[PDB]
Amino acid sequence: LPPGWEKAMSRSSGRVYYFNHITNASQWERPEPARVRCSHLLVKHSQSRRPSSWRQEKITRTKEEALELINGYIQKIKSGEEDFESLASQFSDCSSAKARGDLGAFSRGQMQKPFEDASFALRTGEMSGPVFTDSGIHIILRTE
């Protein structure tokens, strides 16, 4: 299986699925360059390195509450009810919200390590599950 993937069993359905422990992605179907380009949606919490953003001068939500927000955004993106870029522009606690979450292209050794590892393990067009860094919890979309 591709880098980071394992088989798992659904508890509710009992059907086999696949999980990536580097990107925290999960899917039903059976699934390196110098640079990648990614967008992200960041939800900060009270233990972020800087608990403030353009949305909120004092970020007060707990880590648990931020993960619930991330999970809900992932649900709406996967259902097609909302687009990643729309949710990033509206709700990302990163200044890159103004650019639909786009961070541009980057190499290894620039970003926070868990973010970097998830970005390089995604395939082009693929999106992560919740990725935890010192900034908060991220949804990552690899665009190039």
Ligand X SMILES: CN(CCO)c1ccccn1
Per-residue binding letters, 102-131, with ligand X (x by CB under 6 A): -xx---------------------------
* Secondary structure class of 27 (helix, strand, coil): strand
Per-residue binding letters, 47-86, with ligand X (x by CB under 6 A): ----------------xx--x-------------------
Among 22, 69, 99, 105, binds ligand X (CB under 6 A): 99
Q: Do 119 and 139 meet the contact criterion of CB atoms below 8 Å apart?
A: no
Cα separation, 81 vs 58, in Å, equals 30
Is 48 among the catalytic positions? no
What contacts 60, CB < 8 A, 6 or more positions away?
46, 51
Helix or strand run (H / E) with residue 9: strand 5-9
Structure tokens at 111: 């970003």
The CA R_g of the chain, rounded to the nearest whole Å, is 15
Q: Residue 137 Cβ, how far from ligand X at the closest point, in Å?
A: 8
Could you tell me how many residues of this chain bind ligand X (CB under 6 A)? 10
Catalytic residues: 40, 94, 112, 135, 138
> By the criterion CB under 6 A, which residues form the site for ligand X?
63-64, 67, 94-96, 98-99, 103-104
